[PDB]
Design a protein around this nucleic acid. Structure first.
Lengths: 205, 109, 286, 327, 113, 205, 205
RNA sequence: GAUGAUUUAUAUACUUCGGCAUACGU
RNA sequence: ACGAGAACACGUAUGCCGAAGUAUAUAAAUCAUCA
C-alpha cells in the first residue's frame, strides 16, 4: 500500500467567503463572517468544502444514485460497494508567506465587501455587511491520495486533473456566482509519503 | 412548557419565520457550548457579559420588526433571561436553553 | 458471657455446598474453625477452645437490633431480640412475621462472575474458564454477631484471637477480597435478659450433637432440624492433597430439647497429621 | 454546457459602487487651486497630531466650534496652525481629481475597494444590473434556479490613475449641484469581467435584447420627459443625454436612479408606472415626495448626472456600454 | 447595563436624545464597527499602538460630530462616552474594548426598540 | 507471628473497565457494564482482579514450572504444594473524598465509551458500548500481609511493590490494550495492626 | 520482563473530531460532539481510536485474514491461535503546557465549524455541526509496549514507526477525509519504566 | 453663498441525513 | 485446622462511511436643508 501528497497553494483571485460558526454578530458589524481559524484567528478553507466542490464538479462532468468514477475518488458509502475515498482532501491553511506579505504591505488579511439586495419593487435595499479573504491570499493544501489499486492511479488523477483544472475555472465558498472564491492553484508539488509509488510522472494543473 | 404557546398562536406569531428563530437560536447555542466548555456551576463575569450581549441582540431583533417583538413578549423571554443572571446557576441557564430549543422545535411543527 | 459484633468491610462467601452459592451466616463450627486456625497462627494455647469455650452460630443485625434463629415450637428466618419474650410463649401474629420478613434485609446476594486465566498463562492459545462466586454484600452498619461464653481469661484469649481474626478474615475466598471484617464488644441488656431466662424447653444456638453415651437421653420430647455439615480440611499440613471432611450431622440452630446436653468437639478427620475439631457445644437461650 | 465570455464595460458615464463609507469633512484636504483632493489615513494624522502635541488644540478646535460648526474643514485647522502643504506627504494616503458642479467639497463617498485598497467592479453589482434587465424583460425574480447558472466574476484591479471624483447633480429644474461628491471610475474606460452561462438557459442574443428593451422603455417612458425642462435641455446640450436608443446600455452603481434599478417602468405603461412609482416614493420619502401635491412630469423628478470641467461636458450617472466576446 | 436607563430616560413623543436620528447613530458606530473587526482580527489582548491611535481618531470623530451636531453632543455627554473611551485607552486590554463596543451597540439596540 | 496492613489508595489514571456481565442486555444500552454493587451501584474493583493481575505480572517477572515467591504470596493449592496465601488482597472501594468531589461538580462515576469494529471485508462499521470508571477516580487497597515467617517480609514487599510497580505500568481490567484500566498507587501507609513487627521501614509504590 | 513506554505529545493539524455517544436531542447545537474527559471535562483522544486506526493502516500496509506483525502488536483473538497484545495503547489527555497556553491568551479548546450536504436534485443545503479540537492542541500519549520475547522488539518498534508515519499522513476520527484529524507525534522519548531492557537506542519519530 | 441629511444593518431556506445498532471465543 | 484452597469476566474491535455553510441577493434609494 502507498499514499501520496499533492502539496499546492491556492491563491484567491476574487475574495473567497466560507461561512463561519456562531461568531459574535455585532449590531453594525459583519453579519456573515468567514470561517477563520481559532489558534490564530486566521482565515482557513475547510477541506470539506474543497472536497464537496470538487466532487460536485467531477460528478456534473461525468454523471451529467451515485457516479462510480466520483465514488472511487470521494468515497462510496452505500449498502454493497463501500470503497475508501482515495482523496483525503485537507483543510487549506493561511500561509505564512501571505502573513508576512500582508504585514509588510499594510493590507488586511480579509476584505469587507458591503453587499446589498435591492428588491426592485421599492428599491429599499438591505445593507448586509459581508467580508471575504483578500485577493492574493495563499492557502496551503496537502491533499492526500490513497493508492488502493496500483493499476488505477493515473486514471484517478486524470479525473483529479479535471477536478483540479475545472475547479480553477470555477468558484468556491459561498456566493460564488457573484465573483466570490475564484482561485488558482500554484506550486502543486506531488510527492509520495507512504509506499514506493512513482509519482514523478504525475502532474496536476 | 413551550408547546401551548407555540400551538396557541396559517396563524403563527402573525408573521414569524424559521430564519428569525434560528438567528435568535445561534447566540444561545454558542452560549450553551461555551457553558459546556466550563466545568463550574458559577458563570464567570465574561459569561455575564455574553449574556448581556445576548439581551442586547434580543432587544435589537425585537425592535427592528414586529414579529419577533410579539414572539418575545408572548413567550416571557426577557424576564426569563433576566432571571438566568439573577439566579446565577449553570443548570438554570441550560434549562433556559432547553426551553428555547423546545420553542424552536414546536415552531418546526 | 460476652457478645461479639462484626461489621464486614467486604462481601463474604459463606458457602453451603458450592462456590456458586453463599449464605448470610456461618454456623458455630465455621467460626470455631476460624478461631482455631487463628490461635494456631498466633502460636497461643488452644486448650481453652477445646475445653472452656462456648460459642454460637453467627446471627444478623440490622444496624441496631440483633436477631436469633427462629425456634421450632412460617416465613421467618431470624427473629429480633425484642420478640422472643412473646414468640416462645406463642404471641406473634403472622402479619408481624410477614412485616419482619419484608423489613429484614442485612444485605444482598451477588453472583459475581469471574474468570480463570491459568490455562492462558502457559498455553497462551488456550481459553479463559469462567466461574461464579456467590457472595453476600452486607448493608452498612449491618452485619454479624454471636454469643460466646467462658471465663474472663478465656474471654481475653478469644479477644486476642479475634483481634488477629478481623484481619485474618472469615468464610471462603478470604484471600480474594472477601471475609475481612472489624469487631467490637458491646453489651445489650436484652441479650443478657434472654440469656438469663429459664424454661422447660431449651432452644439451641450452635450446631451440636451429644457424646456416644449422652445421645439416647437427648432426643426425648424434641422437635428440631438436623443438617448435613461437610467441607474440606483447610490446612497446609493435614495431607499432601486436599481432603474432604468426614460428613458430620448436627442439630441446626433454633432446635428444641426437653433436656439439655453438654455437646462435644468431635474429631471428624481421618488418620491425618492433625485432628479436625467439629464444634458441637450447644449454647442454650431458653 | 459550459461557456465563458469576456465582457467589456465602457463607461459612457461615471459609475460609483459605494460601500457606506461616507467619509466626512475632516478626512481630506481639497486644493481649490489644483482641482485635487488628498485623502489621508486617520492613524497617520492622529500620530502626527500627537508627535508635536497638536492633538490638544485639535480637540478644542473641533468642539467649541470656530464660528460655523459645519464649515470647519481640515483646511481651517492647518491654516490656524500654519502647517504648510509641502509637508503633508507624511500622512496623506493618496490624491485624486475632483469635478464639482458649482468652493470646497461637502462629503466624499468612497467607492468599493478590496483589502489591497484597489478598485474593482463587483461581480454582484453588475450581475444585479444584468438581472434587473432580464427581470424587466420577463418578471421572474421568484425563480432561484435560473440565476444559479449565471456566474459573474469580479473585475480586475483598476489603476489608481483612472479614477476620479464627481459631484452629484440633480437635473430637476436646472443643473443643481448637490452636496454629495462620489468617487467614480472615469469615463471612456474598458473594464473586463467574465459572464458564464450554464445549461444555456439564457442566450447572449436574448440577454442583449433584454438590455436593449430595458433601455428602450427607460428612454421612452421617463428620460424623454426631461427634454422639456430647461435644466434638462441644458443637460442634453452639454452632452449628458446621448441618443443611444437600441444599444447595449447598463446602469451600474450608486446614484443611477430609482427607475434605472427598478423594473417598475417596464412591466407597466408609462402613465400607470408613473402614478404607482409616485405612490411608492411618497410612501418611502416624506422629505420631498410627501410635500408634492401633484404628480410631476417624472417620478424621480431630478435626473442624476454629473459634469466635468476639464472638457466642459456633462454625463449622466449610470450609462455603460456592455459588449460580449465568447472564449 | 448603563445604556438602558439613559435611552429610556431621553425618549418621548417622536424624538430620541434631542434629535439623534438612527442614521447619525450608525454613522458614529461605523468606526466602532471597523475597530471591532480589527480587534477580532488581532489575537493579542494588548492593543497595538496603531490601534490606540485609531481609537483616539475615533474620539476625534466623536468630537467632530459633537461640534457639528448638538444632538450628538448630548448623546455623547449623557451616555458618558468619552470617559469610557479614556478608560479603554488607559486599560490596554482588548476585553475592555469589546465591552465598550457591546455597551455602544446597546444604545442602538434600545433605540430601535 | 504478626500482621502488616498495607493500606493506601489507587488512582485511576485512565478509564478502568472490569466486566460484570449481568447488568444490561438491551438494544442501544451498554454492551459491557462494569462490576458494581447490586444496590449501592458504586463501581468497585474486586480483590480477585487485583490479585490475579498482580500474580500474572509477578509470574511474568520471575519466570522470564513455577516460582515459589508468587505461590507463597498468593496461594499454591496444587496436588503437592497446598499453601496459604501470605497476602490478602481486599476489594477496592471509592474513597469518600472521591465520592464527595465527584458529587460536588456533578462528575459521573462512570463513562459510557462508544466504539466501532468495522470490517476488513465490507467496512460496514458496527457500534459498541463499553462502561468504564471515570478518569481520576480513586480507590482504597487494604492488602493484609500475614507474616508467616519473619525473615521474608524484607523480601516479600520488594516483590509486592514490584507487583505494584508492574501494576502501575500496566492495565487493570478488561480491554486495557485499547487504552483502559491504567492505575497508579499512592498514599501507601504500611502498618502493623497485629503483633510487634516494625512496619516503619518498608515502602510500597 | 520489561515494559517500554513511548511517551510524547500529539499535535492537531486539522481539527481532530472523535465522535461521542447519543448525548441529547439538541436541535441546532452540538450536532456531533467530540469525545471528552470527565474529571476535567477536557477533549480526550481515546487510545482505542489510536489502536483501531493503527491496526487498520498497518494491516492494509502489510496485507495490501489478519497479518502476523499486526496481530503480534495488537492482538490475535482466534479459536486456537491467540497471542497476547504486546502493545497496550493508552488514552491521550491535554498536556500541562497546552492547557495553560490556550488559557493565557484565550484560545478555545474546541471548534464548532459548520458543514453542508446540499443535494443533487433540489440543493436543500441541509447543514451540519461538527465539534473538533482546536489545532495546535497537544495530547499526551503514553503508549506501553510489553517486551514478551526480546529478539524482535526493535523490529516491532520499526513497525510501529511505520504505523506512526501513516497516522502522521492520515486522519484520526470522523470526517477525516474531509480535512480532519490530521496530527503529528513529537516530544517522544523511549524509556523502560519497569524492567532492565536497554531501550536507549530505540527511536520513534 | 454654504451644507449634506434620512431609510433599510442582512432577509428567505435547509438545522443533519443515509448505513452499521454489537459480534465472535470459553 | 472456615463447602474450603488455587482462579484478572478476560481476548480481538476506528463512533466510523458518504456528504460544499451552501442557494438566491446591484450599498442602493431619495433631493433637499440653511443665509
Amino acid at each position: 500500500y502507498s499514499k501520496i501528497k499533492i502539496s499546492g497553494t491556492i491563491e484567491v483571485v476574487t475574495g473567497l467567503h466560507i461561512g463561519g460558526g456562531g461568531e459574535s454578530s455585532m449590531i453594525g458589524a459583519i453579519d456573515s463572517p468567514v470561517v477563520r481559524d481559532l489558534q490564530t484567528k486566521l482565515p482557513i478553507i475547510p477541506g470539506s468544502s474543497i472536497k464537496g466542490k470538487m466532487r460536485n464538479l467531477l460528478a456534473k462532468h461525468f454523471g451529467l444514485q451515485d457516479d462510480e468514477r466520483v465514488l472511487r475518488l470521494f468515497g462510496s458509502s452505500e449498502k454493497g460497494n463501500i470503497q475508501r475515498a482515495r482523496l483525503q482532501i485537507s483543510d487549506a491553511f493561511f500561509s505564512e508567506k501571505t502573513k508576512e506579505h500582508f504585514a509588510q504591505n499594510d493590507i488586511a488579511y480579509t476584505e469587507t465587501k458591503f453587499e446589498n439586495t435591492i428588491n426592485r419593487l421599492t428599491a429599499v435595499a438591505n445593507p448586509r455587511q459581508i467580508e471575504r479573504v483578500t485577493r492574493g491570499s495563499e492557502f496551503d493544501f496537502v491533499f492526500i491520495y490513497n493508492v488502493d489499486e496500483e493499476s488505477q492511479v493515473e486514471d484517478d488523477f486524470e479525473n483529479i486533473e479535471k477536478a483540479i483544472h475545472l475547479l480553477e475555472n470555477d468558484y468556491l465558498g459561498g456566493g460564488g456566482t457573484r465573483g466570490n472564491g475564484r482561485i488558482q492553484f500554484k506550486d502543486t508539488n506531488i510527492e509520495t509519503v507512504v509506499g514506493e509509488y512513482d509519482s514523478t510522472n504525475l502532474k496536476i494543473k | 412548557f413551550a408547546h401551548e404557546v407555540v400551538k396557541s398562536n396559517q396563524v403563527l406569531f402573525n408573521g414569524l419565520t424559521t430564519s428569525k428563530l434560528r438567528n435568535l437560536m445561534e447566540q444561545v447555542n454558542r452560549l450553551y457550548t461555551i457553558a459546556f466548555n466550563s466545568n463550574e456551576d458559577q458563570l464567570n463575569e465574561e459569561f455575564i457579559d455574553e449574556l448581556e450581549y445576548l439581551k442586547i441582540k434580543f432587544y435589537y431583533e425585537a425592535g427592528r420588526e414586529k414579529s419577533v417583538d410579539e414572539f418575545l413578549k408572548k413567550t416571557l423571554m426577557f424576564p426569563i433571561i433576566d432571571r438566568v443572571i439573577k439566579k446565577e446557576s449553570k443548570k438554570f441557564f441550560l434549562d433556559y436553553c432547553k426551553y428555547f430549543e423546545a420553542l424552536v422545535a414546536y415552531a418546526k411543527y | 458471657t460476652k457478645v461479639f459484633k462484626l461489621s464486614f468491610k467486604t462481601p463474604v462467601h459463606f458457602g453451603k455446598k458450592r462456590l456458586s452459592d453463599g449464605e448470610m451466616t456461618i454456623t458455630a463450627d465455621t467460626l470455631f474453625s476460624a478461631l482455631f486456625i487463628e490461635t494456631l497462627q498466633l502460636g497461643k494455647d488452644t486448650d481453652w477452645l477445646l475445653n472452656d469455650l462456648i460459642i454460637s452460630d453467627t446471627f444478623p443485625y440490622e444496624n441496631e437490633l440483633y436477631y436469633l434463629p427462629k425456634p421450632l415450637i412460617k416465613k421467618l428466618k431470624y427473629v429480633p431480640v425484642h420478640h422472643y419474650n412473646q414468640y416462645l410463649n406463642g404471641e406473634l401474629s403472622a402479619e408481624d412475621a410477614t412485616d419482619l420478613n419484608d423489613i429484614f434485609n442485612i444485605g444482598y446476594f451477588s453472583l459475581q462472575t469471574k474468570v480463570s486465566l491459568i490455562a492462558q498463562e502457559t498455553d497462551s492459545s488456550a481459553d479463559s474458564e469462567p466461574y461464579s462466586v456467590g457472595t453476600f454484600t452486607f448493608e452498612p452498619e449491618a452485619g454479624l454477631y454471636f454469643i460466646a461464653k467462658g471465663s474472663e481469661e478465656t474471654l481475653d484469649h478469644l479477644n486476642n484471637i479475634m483481634t488477629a481474626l478481623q484481619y485474618s478474615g472469615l468464610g471462603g475466598k478470604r484471600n480474594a477480597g472477601y471475609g475481612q471484617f472489624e469487631y467490637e464488644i458491646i453489651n445489650n441488656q436484652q441479650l443478657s435478659k434472654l440469656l438469663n431466662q429459664n424454661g422447660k424447653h431449651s432452644i439451641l444456638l450452635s450446631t451440636a450433637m451429644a457424646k456416644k453415651e449422652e445421645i439416647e437421653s437427648a432426643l426425648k420430647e424434641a422437635r428440631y432440624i438436623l443438617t448435613k455439615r461437610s467441607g474440606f480440611v483447610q490446612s497446609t499440613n493435614y495431607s499432601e492433597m486436599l481432603v474432604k471432611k468426614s460428613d458430620f450431622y448436627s442439630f441446626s440452630s433454633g432446635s428444641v430439647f426437653k433436656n439439655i446436653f453438654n455437646g462435644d468437639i468431635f474429631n471428624v478427620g481421618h488418620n491425618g497429621k492433625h485432628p479436625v475439631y467439629r464444634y458441637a457445644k450447644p449454647l442454650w437461650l431458653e | 454546457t459550459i461557456k465563458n465570455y469576456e465582457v467589456v464595460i465602457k463607461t459612457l458615464g461615471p459609475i460609483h459602487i459605494g460601500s457606506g463609507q461616507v467619509m466626512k469633512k475632516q478626512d481630506y484636504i481639497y486644493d481649490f487651486y489644483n482641482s485635487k483632493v488628498y485623502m489621508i489615513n486617520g492613524n497617520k494624522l492622529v500620530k502626527f497630531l500627537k508627535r508635536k502635541n497638536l492633538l490638544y488644540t485639535y480637540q478644542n478646535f473641533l468642539r467649541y466650534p470656530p464660528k460655523n460648526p459645519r464649515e470647519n474643514g481640515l483646511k481651517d485647522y492647518l491654516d490656524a496652525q500654519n502647517v504648510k502643504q509641502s509637508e503633508w506627504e507624511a500622512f496623506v494616503s493618496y490624491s485624486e481629481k475632483v469635478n464639482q458642479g458649482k468652493k470646497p467639497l461637502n462629503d466624499l463617498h468612497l467607492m468599493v475597494r478590496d483589502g489591497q485598497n484597489k478598485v474593482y467592479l463587483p461581480g454582484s453589482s453588475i450581475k444585479g444590473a444584468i438581472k434587473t434587465t432580464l427581470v424587466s424583460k420577463y418578471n421572474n425574480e421568484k425563480n432561484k434556479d435560473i440565476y444559479s447558472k449565471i456566474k459573474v466574476s469580479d473585475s480586475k484591479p483598476i489603476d489608481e490613475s483612472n479614477l476620479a471624483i464627481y459631484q452629484k447633480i440633480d437635473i430637476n429644474k436646472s443643473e443643481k449641484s448637490m452636496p454629495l461628491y462620489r468617487e467614480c471610475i472615469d469615463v471612456n474606460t474598458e473594464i473586463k469581467f467574465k459572464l458564464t452561462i450554464e445549461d444555456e438557459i439564457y442566450s447572449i442574443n436574448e440577454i442583449e435584447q433584454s438590455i436593449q428593451d430595458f433601455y428602450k422603455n427607460y428612454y421612452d417612458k421617463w428620460l424623454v420627459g426631461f427634454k422639456e425642462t430647461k435644466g434638462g435641455r441644458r443637460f442634453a446640450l452639454e452632452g449628458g443625454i446621448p441618443d443611444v436608443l437600441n444599444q447595449n446600455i447598463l446602469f451600474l452603481g450608486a446614484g443611477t436612479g430609482f427607475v434605472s434599478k427598478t423594473t417598475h417602468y417596464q412591466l407597466k405603461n408609462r402613465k400607470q408606472a408613473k402614478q404607482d412609482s409616485f405612490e411608492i416614493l411618497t410612501k418611502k420619502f416624506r422629505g420631498t415626495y410627501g410635500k408634492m401635491k401633484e404628480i410631476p412630469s417624472n417620478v424621480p423628478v431630478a435626473l442624476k448626472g454629473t459634469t466635468n470641467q476639464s472638457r466642459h461636458t456633462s454625463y449622466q450617472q449610470g450609462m455603460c456600454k456592455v459588449s460580449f466576446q465568447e472564449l
